């Protein structure tokens, strides 16, 4: 075990660690998380919340949220066509606060 | 258009911008990007590369890579069972360097 050897391996592990199941910030399209009837739009269409992702030690395991809170995010509801008026509505979208690899 | 009004809207747009199609760093499981025959493992199993994602202005559009480079990432190949020895191999994994919303 030379000294140059260690550093690289180290670094590779840090790589491996940064890929592990955690709540990472992601872009969620609000339509796909609700009923979305009769072409009631959103603007903006998407929102930045934290979500679970990343790899697991064993294959059968998956990154699943173990806890979740719900942020409120002001958005414009546009029903086009057509009317009248889009209003500033606070929609509740799931922020994942806990994760763990699980079955499945 | 009051002054408090502006700030919030501003901020919401910045939200909207941060969700738009771009190359964002993500965790790729190396098995799923190759042949993966006869249970030839990897360790670590995953790797941090840049990939395309995010929302698009219109619905029919998707974030697609328009350019891609290929990073080389030293990994351990373990064929278990079983032998012999896992060796430090440089695998070539796709780093997305360009994106744009497209059809589809
Ligand atoms: C893990 O996070 C997900 C979000 O990705 C959570 O799923 C959500 O769970 C809530 C609460 O059960 C669901 O709200 C429900 O919606 C139904 C019908 O759409 C409504 O009738 C109920 O009254 C309720 O409000 C929501 O649908 C669901 N969202 C999804 C899956 O898209 C889940 O709760 C989280 N799980 C853990 C372990 O915390
Ligand atoms: C949405 O979920 C994200 C992540 O799941 C939440 O961010 C997390 O907030 C918690 C709050 O306790 C942070 O815990 C602590 O953070 C401080 C930061 O200095 C740290 O010193 C402590 O050791 C501890 O970790 C956590 O770090 C943070 N995670 C990330 C990645 O930002 C966020 O709060 C959730 N949104 C809301 C408002 O519920
Ligand atoms: C967008 O990025 C993707 C990666 O997610 C690129 O897909 C990859 O394209 C390369 C080059 O065509 C493929 O390599 C090929 O593999 C086949 C068989 O597996 C081999 O026979 C060929 O000789 C070649 O080396 C690779 O399979 C493919 N990877 C995927 C899709 O998982 C794609 O090139 C990028 N597109 C743009 C617009 O740059
Ligand atoms: C893998 O792809 C990522 C992103 O697709 C590459 O990161 C990007 O690298 C380019 C190199 O030109 C950066 O462009 C310039 O970055 C400097 C940073 O100070 C900035 O001042 C310039 O305005 C310009 O944007 C780009 O920012 C950067 N993107 C991110 C999000 O990091 C990365 O280089 C690719 N891996 C390899 C080695 O091919
Ligand atoms: O319909 C009321 C309730 O139903 C369910 C989900 O689609 C929620 O978004 C919605 O608020
Ligand atoms: O089989 C050779 C070549 O085939 C294709 C892909 O699976 C590549 O990963 C591999 O290198």
From Swiss-Prot, chains A, B:
Glycosylation sites: 65, 95
Tissue specificity remark: Highly expressed in lung, heart, small intestine and fetal lung, and at lower levels in skeletal muscle, colon, and pancreas.
Disulfide bonds: 21-63, 52-99, 56-101
Localization: Secreted
Post-translational modification: Undergoes a complex proteolytic maturation which generates a variety of processed secreted forms with increased activity toward VEGFR-3 and VEGFR-2. VEGF-D first form an antiparallel homodimer linked by disulfide bonds before secretion. The fully processed VEGF-D is composed mostly of two VEGF homology domains (VHDs) bound by non-covalent interactions.
Lineage top rank: taxon: Eukaryota
Entry similarity comment: Belongs to the PDGF/VEGF growth factor family.
Subunit structure: Homodimer; non-covalent and antiparallel.
Purpose of the protein: Growth factor active in angiogenesis, lymphangiogenesis and endothelial cell growth, stimulating their proliferation and migration and also has effects on the permeability of blood vessels. May function in the formation of the venous and lymphatic vascular systems during embryogenesis, and also in the maintenance of differentiated lymphatic endothelium in adults. Binds and activates VEGFR-2 (KDR/FLK1) and VEGFR-3 (FLT4) receptors.
Protein name: Vascular endothelial growth factor D
């Amino acid at each position: 075990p030379t000294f140059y050897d260690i550093e690289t391996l180290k670094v590779i592990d840090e790589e491996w660690q940064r890929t592990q199941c955690s709540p990472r910030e992601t872009a969620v399209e609000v339509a796909s998380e609700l009923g979305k009837s009769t072409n009631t739009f959103f603007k903006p269409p998407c929102v930045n919340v934290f979500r679970c992702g990343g790899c697991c030690n064993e294959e059968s395991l998956i990154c699943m949220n173990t806890s979740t809170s719900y942020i409120s995010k002001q958005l414009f509801e546009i029903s086009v066509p057509l009317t009248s008026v889009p209003e500033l509505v606070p929609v509740k979208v799931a922020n994942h606060t806990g994760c763990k690899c699980l079955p499945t």
